[PDB]
DNA sequence: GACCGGAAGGAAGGAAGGAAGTGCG
DNA sequence: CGCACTTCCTTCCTTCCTTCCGGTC
């Protein structure tokens, strides 16, 4: 998170969301974990530039997001296009598991 | 694992498969001259014989973001291969 | 020898060996061609069999995809959750 | 050169002679090299050390333990792309206190 | 129906890293 | 024992689709 002091994708997003100077490509839509991609093409490019993977597009990025469904990090907001919600309870388990 | 674009240019070089696909100029502008037949071969080759143009076109409509090919705006079954896009992957 | 740690190929064969585990995974062919009827279950079982929580099919399948290069097993091109065990690789291993 | 051959040596042995470009060669005058056939490099390495089970996956692991030793680097993004750290091989042959 | 693209999911395989096991020295 | 790996996974992806649409053309 902001206490992750390689870069995971779910972190890369929170990094941008925190500084709302990057609101031109992505920002929040309701503070209850609900965020929305304003320029998915731009989001992918940055994540590409980061990983030295300039061919990286939403098409390939999207896949990586939808792997966080079984391992609960984030969720799909039904219908709402480009809308995903973070499972805070899920990341807490991942970051501090209780056997 | 052979890609889709590789499979297309397999049967465009050999014009003995002109019953399925052919050229409309050497400007990277080919023509899908038997969509139903075109769909069968990919499915048969991939062990996925349920493949139709509907699902196959989606695969070719993921080639827009990736500068590999595009559509001939309006014209039917007419897609333009990026010959400066294949050179990038050579 | 297979005394040190349980190998994944050995982990899967321990369940389909008999039944009662047929609900999540079982055989489909004499060659083998086993099929996972509930991969979500199989993942959890292997994830608790080795005491490794946060285990899914993706992480499991990746390990079974490394088995291609070694020639331990082969995948049935197209068929969903379909893999066939290769006698060649397992013969070379086993006790030696 | 400065000649149980170690792995980091085995690769540099091949890069010298331009006849081994088939499987591995240079890609820049900054110690950058690509494995043009990793499966081939593994086969030669499995024969050399006499470990015929050898692949790229296990070969690579050894090269990714070299990161901690500061022997070589991952050329980020580029496929099969690794680069030697000249600084962290002088430390091995001339460990200065 | 062609033709378009989001979204949910298989499937190959590179790359980073823990962890026990293997000789060799 | 200390080194230098080797063996075998987890882990997290990038990559190329297959499938299923709803929706415009
Ligand atoms: Na699932
Ligand atoms: Na690195």
Coordinates of C-alpha atoms in Angstrom, one line a residue, chain B residues 52-89:
Chain B
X52 CA -16.8 -18.6 -35.8
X53 CA -16.0 -15.2 -37.5
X54 CA -17.8 -13.5 -34.5
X55 CA -15.1 -14.8 -32.1
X56 CA -12.3 -14.7 -34.7
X57 CA -13.1 -11.0 -35.6
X58 CA -12.8 -10.1 -31.8
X59 CA -9.3 -11.6 -31.9
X60 CA -8.5 -9.3 -35.0
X61 CA -10.3 -6.4 -33.2
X62 CA -7.6 -6.7 -30.4
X63 CA -5.1 -5.9 -33.2
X64 CA -6.2 -2.2 -33.2
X65 CA -4.5 -1.2 -29.9
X66 CA -1.4 -3.3 -31.1
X67 CA -0.3 -1.6 -34.4
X68 CA -0.2 -5.0 -36.3
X69 CA -3.2 -4.4 -38.6
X70 CA -6.4 -2.3 -38.9
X71 CA -9.8 -2.2 -40.8
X72 CA -10.6 -0.5 -44.3
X73 CA -13.2 2.0 -42.8
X74 CA -16.7 0.9 -44.2
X75 CA -15.5 -1.7 -46.8
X76 CA -16.6 -5.3 -45.9
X77 CA -14.0 -8.0 -44.8
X78 CA -11.2 -5.6 -45.7
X79 CA -8.3 -5.3 -43.1
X80 CA -4.9 -3.6 -43.7
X81 CA -1.8 -5.4 -42.5
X82 CA 0.8 -2.9 -40.9
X83 CA 4.0 -3.9 -43.0
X84 CA 5.9 -1.4 -40.7
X85 CA 4.2 -3.3 -37.8
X86 CA 5.5 -6.8 -38.8
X87 CA 9.0 -5.2 -39.3
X88 CA 8.8 -4.2 -35.6
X89 CA 8.3 -7.9 -34.7

